[PDB]
């Protein structure tokens with residue numbers, strides 16, 4: 129049985145940790161909502 | 168129960184202890200999450216019940232108490248922040264520049280950040296604090312890491 133709990137306000141934080149790359153990938157989306165890589 | 172705007176954890180007591188299966192956004196009295204988090208099942212908020220209102224397995228989105236309210240979009244240029252709510256850990260903003268998912272039906276933003284599967288439904292924000300999409304549906308790359316799409320719904 130599922131329940132929800134508050135975890136915070138939705139705001140932008142100035143000087144948050146900046147990480148992660150920006151990959152450009154060829155993908156396909158099937159009828160079940162699952163993504164897959166096309167190569 | 169609690170209908171204040173904000174980010175919420177989606178929890179279950181079906182498995183061992185209390186387990187976090189995902190996250191969602193409360194905005195304008197509507198709860199927004201990814202379909203794979205709840206599978207369209209009802210939710211509890213204190214003593215109150217939240218019933219599903221709209222959902223789609225292909226978009227992997229679901230709204231409760233009313234129609235989908237989030238309509239902001241990534242501008243295709245600027246950095247964004249993932250407001251990650253990891254299981255058992257405090258909400259944390261992480262800024263990143265999104266990549267691109269190129270599909271036969273158009274391009275979609277993508278964030279390359281790795282978090283537990285129980286973080287699915289965490290919102291992605293623009294510099295004004297607007298929710299431009301939810302994190303949790305994407306693909307696994309060569310090294311085993313995840314790249315999620317910036318999944319956004321349509322506000323009717």
Ligand SMILES: O=C(Nc1ccc2c(c1)CNC2)c1cc2ncccc2s1
Pocket residue numbers: 160161162203227281282283284287303304305313315
């Ligand atoms: O498996 C996942 N997501 C998902 C599950 C079931 C379905 C869909 C997506 C869409 N169709 C049904 C993951 C989300 C995630 N986040 C960060 C790191 C690793 C993962 S794996």
